[PDB]
Design a protein around this ligand. Sequence first.
Ligand SMILES: COc1ccccc1C(=O)[C@@H]1CCC[C@H]1C(C(=O)O)C(=O)O
Ligand SMILES: COc1ccccc1C(=O)[C@@H]1CCC[C@H]1C(C(=O)O)C(=O)O
Lengths: 226, 227
Amino acid sequence: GGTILVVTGTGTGVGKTVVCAALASAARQAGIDVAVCKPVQTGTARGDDDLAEVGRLAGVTQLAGLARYPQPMAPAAAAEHAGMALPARDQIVRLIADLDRPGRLTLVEGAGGLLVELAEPGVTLRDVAVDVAAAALVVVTADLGTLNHTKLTLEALAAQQVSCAGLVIGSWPDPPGLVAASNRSALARIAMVRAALPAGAASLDAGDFAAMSAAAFDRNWVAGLV
Amino acid sequence: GGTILVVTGTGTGVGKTVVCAALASAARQAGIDVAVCKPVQTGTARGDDDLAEVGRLAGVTQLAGLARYPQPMAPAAAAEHAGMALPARDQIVRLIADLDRPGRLTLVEGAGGLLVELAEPGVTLRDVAVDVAAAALVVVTADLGTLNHTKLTLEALAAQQVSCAGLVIGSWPDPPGLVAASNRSALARIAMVRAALPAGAASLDAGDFAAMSAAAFDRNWVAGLVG
Ligand SMILES: COc1ccccc1C(=O)[C@@H]1CCC[C@H]1C(C(=O)O)C(=O)O
Ligand SMILES: COc1ccccc1C(=O)[C@@H]1CCC[C@H]1C(C(=O)O)C(=O)O
């Protein structure tokens, strides 16, 4: 086996996908082979496609997914509106296990937050992280309310003995602002802050995004992941 | 004592204050003595004052505060920015204990979400709820992301054996879109939804607000809150 990380977020729209891309880009530039699994993708009718974004921004080609739902809703909700079930727990765990190989960083991107139902019946990304012995990287905001949401997510991880690999602020504003500066310091008291991605980074071309990502993370930490 | 309910939320801006006012108004109209307590208030320099809004919307005069900090931030940062300290645990507990009495419903309004630090060191509303044997009413939104936030908050309450008194949707759109309708159904499968306050409730006058409040909750639930 290699290294499996689940990438979750404290909520929706926190920048999980740009963080997957930035970490993928950083890790490739560190010579690591990277796969990204997005088992469940919703919001396709309006053009959401997180794997494609990871492809454009970081050049990853091992991009695996199982299901795509048009409605911009939580999977269970999108799957009910569509009249079709979610994938099986079995499918998700085994797709991830087959992606994973020595020398490879495999990132598993949830949909929304940690306790959204990903597979039938009621199985979450937390359940999947247990099954594949993955640690969890938590994407957070620097905005008002982030400390509570982060602490809640970390408690939920520890309740099932899922290790936390750190936090990433998905969007760092410019200029920061009083709240954002305060929250960054407080977040670092609760866990390791691996990066804070400049606001607007998702609009970069691949070259600029690759330079941003290399500077965003600690090179030694990245190298140590595998 | 009487009944103590802490009123928390899945985050900030979910409508805890209007929910406190609405439940207070419904209980008063059922003949229940109501006090509302806000042990930590931030944002006072921008005019934030939840107790005064409760009084204005619901007519409550039994209102009790404790700590007030100027900046509209989490209490620890707001207190640091003002060169002040957070209250001690027993200052919060004594405030609640002094209000509590038989026949009375005492609502304790949190600051932000459940695990926000209210007192040194790392004391949260969840700890306070344990100390005063209160159940927790959880205020939620109907928007994308509420299910995860609600489940995280209920799991945290259960981790300390704090009973969940149910959910209240702080702002309910009319008409409800597909997403809000779907989230309300999912929310009700997680826990009892005690009310869904109409959007804009905070702008109703006293009589409209009182009428909205009486219709918002099951009267048998409200009446049963206090023996
Ligand atoms: C399933 O998770 C959710 C939970 C609650 C609310 C919304 C969602 C979403 O799916 C959003 C909506 C479409 C895009 C998705 C987005 C992404 O593609 O990154 C995300 O994961 O938040
Ligand atoms: C202090 O706790 C917090 C922690 C994190 C984020 C926000 C808050 C707030 O308190 C907000 C900020 C000002 C108004 C407050 C509001 C209310 O007065 O109703 C609330 O309590 O959420």
